[PDB]
Design an enzyme around this catalytic site. Structure first.
Site, PDB file in Angstrom:
ATOM      1  CD  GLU A  11      -3.107  -0.900   0.141  1.00 18.07           C
ATOM      2  OE1 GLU A  11      -3.957  -1.758   0.045  1.00 18.07           O
ATOM      3  OE2 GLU A  11      -3.143   0.122  -0.553  1.00 18.07           O
ATOM      4  CG  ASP A  20      -7.860   4.089  -4.442  1.00 21.05           C
ATOM      5  OD1 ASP A  20      -8.363   4.554  -5.454  1.00 21.05           O
ATOM      6  OD2 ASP A  20      -8.522   3.376  -3.721  1.00 21.05           O
TER       7      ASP A  20
END
Ligand SMILES: [Cl-]
Length: 164
Positions: A11, A20
């Site tokens: 991540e 994202d």
């Protein structure tokens, strides 16, 4: 290697609001704020999550606190879900980390949709599950990440995350 190090690799860590891979507002170690296209909505969610007037920036400690809460929530979501619990319970500890990774990224409902792959995991048909898992939007949209998780399901080792 453990689940926290694994997700931190997948991540990253950013201390300012970012988008994202799907374009949604996010912060920290993959903490989704909102699917709304309003940055003001996202700053409101961040301030509610952290408990202070943040102005879109958090500290490393705050990011790791959200991260601890999100990993805990992913595990409890697995254990409460009737489709997911018996699969998780059947797996060894390394492959359990792969299942938590998937729930962290795509949520409990999303993973419970991988009905065929879950059955193959429960039966310990590793090469077959690995093929079925790659026939997915998930694999085509985030192929390097999906490969690492799938390798972990296929081998029961951390080899995909060593070197990184
Ligand atoms: Cl990727």
């Amino acid at each position: 290697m453990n689940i926290f190090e694994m997700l931190r690799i997948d991540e990253g860590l950013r201390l300012k609001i970012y988008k994202d891979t799907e374009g949604y507002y996010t912060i920290g170690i993959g903490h989704l704020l909102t699917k709304s296209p309003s940055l003001n909505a996202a700053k409101s969610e961040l301030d509610k999550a952290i408990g202070r007037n943040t102005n879109g920036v958090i500290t490393k400690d705050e990011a790791e606190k959200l991260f601890n809460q999100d990993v805990d929530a992913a595990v409890r979501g697995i254990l409460r879900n009737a489709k997911l619990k018996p699969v998780y319970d059947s797996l060894d500890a390394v492959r359990r980390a792969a299942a938590i990774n998937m729930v962290f990224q795509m949520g409990e409902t999303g993973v419970a949709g991988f009905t065929n792959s879950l059955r193959m995991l429960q039966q310990k048909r590793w090469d077959e599950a690995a093929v079925n898992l790659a026939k997915s939007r998930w694999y085509n949209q985030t192929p390097n990440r999906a490969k690492r998780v799938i390798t972990t399901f296929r081998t029961g080792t951390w080899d995909a995350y060593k070197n990184l």
